[PDB]
Amino acid sequence: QVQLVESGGGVVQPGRSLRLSCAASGFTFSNYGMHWVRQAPGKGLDWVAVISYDAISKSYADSVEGRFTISRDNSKNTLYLQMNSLRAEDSAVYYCAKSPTAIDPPFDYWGQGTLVTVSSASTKGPSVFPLAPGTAALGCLVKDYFPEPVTVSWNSGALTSGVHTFPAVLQSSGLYSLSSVVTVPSSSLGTQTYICNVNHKPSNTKVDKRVEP
């Protein structure tokens, strides 16, 4: 089966450089055109660049021309995007996409994406505060972290029904904050323990938090 795996994303400071790559498997890589597409958080799809099957032909969106360079290694089945002079608005999930033919769209297979955040903020783990409680609700406030993403589970995954983990908001401080809630029976508050497990992988921050009535 056709498989595309991106890597190289992360935090980079404005003006600096970042190289994304995309490892392809499951097809004859060197027969197909390859593309990069990006998607800023909450926004539409945005074509970035194309390289033909044989690397002879290349083309770039106006927004990135002169700054980005697409290339490929057909012996290593790898696609590359060299991104120079990065600006805040280049921040996006970046997808590699395969062409069913030699260079043209459409994009018949897509990678999973790699998140690129252009920012001067420093990587920072979240503070985790309790949101204490027929039906009760409780939760966790995951405040003041950078960059995305954060994962949140409840009772180490032994509790998923009634859980809502909300999209994070970017605060004035350049930091993110999200909340996660769960509704449980009120009769459960006296016996059942509730713990939210927050994981901020960029900072190696793993926080378990007991939520007390």
Next chain:
Amino acid sequence: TYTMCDKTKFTWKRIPTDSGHDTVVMEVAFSGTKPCRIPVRAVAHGSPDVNVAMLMTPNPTIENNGGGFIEMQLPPGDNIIYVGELSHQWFQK
């Protein structure tokens, strides 16, 4: 500065034809993303690595509205003309 046209999307509008002026002419149609430069080459049978297409139209393109005509001279004998993956035989006197 054009990209090479997608080699999988060509068809003959006019297969290779004697021009009357000691050249070979043809017209392709292209169904892909435009505009682009037409990849055209030729080989003599048995010699796949040596291009023999001498183009009177050196920079053939498919424009957003127009293009597709190609004129070339070929060496005597059995030749194959390729526009992308599209092919046609040509025997040259």
Next chain:
Amino acid sequence: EIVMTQSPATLSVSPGERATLSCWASQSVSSNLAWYQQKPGQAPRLLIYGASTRATGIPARFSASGSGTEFTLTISSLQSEDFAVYYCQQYNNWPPRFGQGTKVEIKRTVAAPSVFIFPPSDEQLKSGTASVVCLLNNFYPREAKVQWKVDNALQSGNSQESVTEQDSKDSTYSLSSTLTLSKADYEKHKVYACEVTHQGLSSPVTKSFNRGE
């Protein structure tokens, strides 16, 4: 420049019913037009290419027609997994251009939110900031108004909101609103209130607490 315009922006369709999405081009793109489906948190998936050809593995209830400047995607019987953002893409001319997308959501009966208010925790108050959180749980449709009140004075500019994707089990939305005060401002006031206007509530619902009770 070729401008791709999708219509409408958002589409509510009852399950098992039909959905019809339009794509307009500012000039002719012949039949070189593709449709993509993207579900939340996932890469896009090609549905249609050549204006009308179903891609590999796409169920028969997806069909598409059109050419030149007008194109249509139809889902004849909308099933639970068919709810996503749909993009068109012209690839007749370099650069290929995506439309801005059409969101297809489930239509369901009106459901009023369950409202809950959470004071700042004492752990957070040690830090010199106070976050007050208001939860609107499992409501439909998506449009909802939150108004924060501090000792009965209406707040503005000091709150941020976040909404979940439509729930796959019950097709509702949830919303979280955070009011942020300094510790000093928070300790200057007594009654903290979250007031909720929604189509399912015959009058606005207020949840409140008194600082220190």
